[PDB]
């Protein structure tokens, strides 16, 4: 999924890190 | 290392690209506004008179907006709507008949 309006699945490959 | 992850991307790099995106933004906004107008008329929250005058004007603004965008890479409104994932079937039907739903 690529469209922001189709949900948080759009962020699936976006890496996050803690601090 | 990976370098392109550390600089933010821009939408346009020159005068002609900005011009193009200015015009595409207006097309996109005219279609979505037409779509919201059709939806409001379904929901019966606008008079047939207020609706018709607003929809006539949007169709005139629409036809100019698309003429300004139409060219080598965008040939039709269905191609534009698909490139930018703009699903507005009510707007599309008003454009097809070129007249308000009244």
């Amino acid at each position: 999924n690529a469209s922001s309006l189709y949900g948080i699945s759009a962020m699936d490959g976006v890496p996050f890190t803690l601090h | 290392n990976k370098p392109e992850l550390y600089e933010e991307v821009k939408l346009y790099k020159n005068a002609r690209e900005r011009e193009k995106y200015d015009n595409m933004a207006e097309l996109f906004a005219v279609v979505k506004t037409m779509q919201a107008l059709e939806k409001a008329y379904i929901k019966d929250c606008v008079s047939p008179s207020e609706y018709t005058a607003a929809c006539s004007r949007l169709l005139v603004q629409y036809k100019a907006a698309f003429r300004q965008v139409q060219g080598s890479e965008i040939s039709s409104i269905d191609e534009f709507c698909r490139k930018f994932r703009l699903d507005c079937p009510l707007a599309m039907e008003r454009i097809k008949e070129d007249r308000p739903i009244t």
């Binding site: 999924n1 690529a2 922001s4 309006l5 759009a10 962020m11 490959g13 976006v14 890496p15 996050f16 890190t17 803690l18 601090h19 | 990976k2 392109e4 992850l5 550390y6 600089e7 933010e8 991307v9 821009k10 939408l11 995106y21 595409m24 933004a25 207006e26 996109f28 906004a29 005219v30 979505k32 506004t33 919201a36 107008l37 939806k39 409001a40 929901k43 929250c45 606008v46 207020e50 609706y51 607003a54 949007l58 930018f84 994932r85």
Partner: protein
């Protein structure tokens, strides 16, 4: 700031996260303008003006998000 405890890993992912949230926030705004017209709390002309202005902004975010996702190697 609890918002700062879990964050994207590089500036471009941050941009992408900001574009995702802004575009959704605009859709939320447009949706309740439509609901405010049906309730009669705004009239047609102020409705069509703000939807127009908000949809223009959402195009720029959407077109940008396409460029950002492709620059990062994400699906598009």
């Amino acid at each position: 700031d609890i918002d700062e405890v879990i964050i994207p890993t590089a500036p471009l992912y941050k941009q992408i996260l900001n574009l995702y949230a802004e575009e959704n926030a605009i859709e939320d705004t447009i949706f309740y303008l439509g609901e405010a017209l049906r309730r009669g709390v705004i009239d047609l002309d102020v409705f069509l003006k703000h939807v127009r202005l908000l949809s223009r902004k959402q195009f720029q975010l959407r077109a940008l998000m396409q460029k950002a996702r492709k620059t990062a190697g994400l699906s598009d």
